[PDB]
């Protein structure tokens, strides 16, 4: 059997090779088109009325076919971009699963109640310390006189 990673990496350059063929069967048609242009230019010198229209029709045919060649070439590109973002999606999924596992096993040690107990104890100790300070200053400062 073949790993799924091999299938995607094979499809990548398989679609690239399809683009390659589309490039070639495109490229032959611009050569054909330039030949038609040369023929129509040299033939128009003597006139002859009608056969110029047939050559112009053939020119339009060549343009219409290079249209479709470019179109399928573009379609292969979109297919490749989808299959490429697919593994990015898979990577996002696995990294998200990992971070969720980590965060769960992290906050499984400290919950709502015991930190609340620690926090209430903090507040009580702060109360005690502040009462120490306030009355310690109070009684000995009020012991002072004439000021």
């Amino acid at each position: 059997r073949k790993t799924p990673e091999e299938l995607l990496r094979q499809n990548q350059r398989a679609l690239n090779r399809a683009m390659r063929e589309l490039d070639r069967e495109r490229q032959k048609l611009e050569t054909q088109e330039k030949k038609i242009i040369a023929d129509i230019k040299k033939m128009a010198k003597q006139g002859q009325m009608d056969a110029v229209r047939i050559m112009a029709k053939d020119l339009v045919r060549t343009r219409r076919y290079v249209r479709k060649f470019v179109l399928m070439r573009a379609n292969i590109q979109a297919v490749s971009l989808k299959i490429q973002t697919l593994k990015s999606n898979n990577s996002m999924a696995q990294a998200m699963k990992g971070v969720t596992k980590a965060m769960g096993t992290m906050n499984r040690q400290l919950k709502l109640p015991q930190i609340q107990k620690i926090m209430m104890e903090f507040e009580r100790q702060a109360e005690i310390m502040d009462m120490k300070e306030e009355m310690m200053n109070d009684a000995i400062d009020d012991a002072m006189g004439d000021e």
Binding site: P4, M55, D58, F69
Partner: protein, 159 residues
């Protein structure tokens, strides 16, 4: 395998196009043969024979046009065959792309993703309540309006 037979018959398409092209060039050879006869008949003093020579010339021109139209039809059908070869290749590549998408979706699906969705949401919810409560309780300790007021005063004496 359609590829080699498509190439095999494309090798015959312009094989016969060159036959057509030679058929054509022979006609311009005969047209050049007869154009100078038109010229000579024009110069020889009696012009009304040149009309019949022109009857010959325009028939030759029509033959040229018909041969060129035949060659153009051949070219068009050839281009159709090439277009469809491209289409079939696109279809096969698309089938392979569907196969690889099947292979990749064989790994993960909605239910595991939904489990991750809800687990992450709950974990972050508890996380946010813990963090907000901690920030509030540490700020339940010292001044806010005062303890911010001298802050820019501290900055003012720095700059």
């Amino acid at each position: 395998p359609p590829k080699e037979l498509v190439n095999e018959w494309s090798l015959k398409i312009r094989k016969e196009m060159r036959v057509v092209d030679r058929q054509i060039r022979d006609i311009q050879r005969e047209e050049e043969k007869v154009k100078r006869s038109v010229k000579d008949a024009a110069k020889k003093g009696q012009k009304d024979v040149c009309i019949v020579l022109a009857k010959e010339m325009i028939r030759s021109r029509k033959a040229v046009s018909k041969l060129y139209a035949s060659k153009a039809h051949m070219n068009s059908v050839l281009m159709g065959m090439k277009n469809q070869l491209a289409v079939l290749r696109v279809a096969g590549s698309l089938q392979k792309s569907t196969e690889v998408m099947k292979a990749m979706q064989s790994l993960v699906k909605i239910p595991e993703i939904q489990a991750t969705m809800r687990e992450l949401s709950k974990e972050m919810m508890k996380a946010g309540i813990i963090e907000e409560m901690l920030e509030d309780t540490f700020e339940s300790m010292d001044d806010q309006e005062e303890m911010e007021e001298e802050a820019e005063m501290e900055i003012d004496r720095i700059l």
